[PDB]
Symmetry: D3
Subunit: 67 residues, 6 copies
């Protein structure tokens, strides 16, 4: 598919629409919550809604380690 | 406490050291695997090693939605 | 301790709250000003306020060189 | 100039060349150190060298707050 | 000269201002379109308007590959 | 469908493998060139080779504006 190595499946538990951006919160395995801030245009075009099953995607070079 | 909203606990299952960067692979809840590319310097100062328990951190503005 | 190599201490001199995001401006050593755009949620959970002493954090792979 | 709001002037105190990437460390005001990981091609083309006076640049959406 | 390896000349065909951020859409050579989300402050300081001729800039480490 | 708003079709004209990362250069429509730095693992898993027809993908929040 795509080079981004992090692909986490989950369900939408939160949605907040802005003017330029929008926030999507997904509940994944173990009950952890992933928060995404993307364009309002993409949220609308993809038809994001509470309860939908979507996948969070993250490029490897954007992941930090806390030790 | 840091603003980055995504913080996922896991165990180190893969580690590869380059010249400038290094790759850390974490196994988190549900079997999901997180891949991180960071500086070699940080991997050495943090003492990252296979089997260690660490946390992956990702800023909300870097998470995309696939669906 | 986090892998992100850039950690700069400063004082909050500007704060603007949007619908989804928020802007924090920090004055660091030498008079330099750091601008951060993060989630509104994090700005509220952290209790960020003008005059507060906080730290700006930036991952090494996000820093470019101009010259 | 450019939209990236963070522009920090400094002097090169460290340089490490990889195969694909390279690390540049700059000393800025207050003695803080900024670490950048960019392409080896750009380090070579810009002629980066120990002691040179350059500027570190960071997009606002890549800056986190630690409180 | 900046290290960011992707520099695409274009014309502004879309501009949407928010509270904290702003969206800029550029038409570039070959019939492609680029969408940028940056600070409202930078859009105003740069004098961005529909019809302006500007350049979109992306760091190499932020570009993914889809197959 | 992914939320990333920038999707540019091209042909691979350059490939350089490192230890941890890898550099891919694509020629896109209109005579523009895109440079991507991703994981070596993804380059190998995707079967990236010179001459391949692939798509470069960038999140809107990573695109700056130069005037
Ligand atoms: Cl190794
Ligand atoms: Cl406000
Ligand atoms: Na980032």
């Amino acid at each position: 598919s795509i080079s981004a190595r992090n692909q986490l499946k989950g369900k939408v538990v939160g949605l907040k629409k802005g003017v330029v951006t929008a926030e999507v919160v997904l509940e994944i395995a173990g009950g952890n919550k992933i928060t995404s801030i993307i364009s309002l245009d993409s949220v609308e075009e993809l038809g994001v809604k509470e309860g939908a099953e979507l996948t969070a995607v993250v490029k490897s070079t954007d992941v930090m380690i806390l030790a």
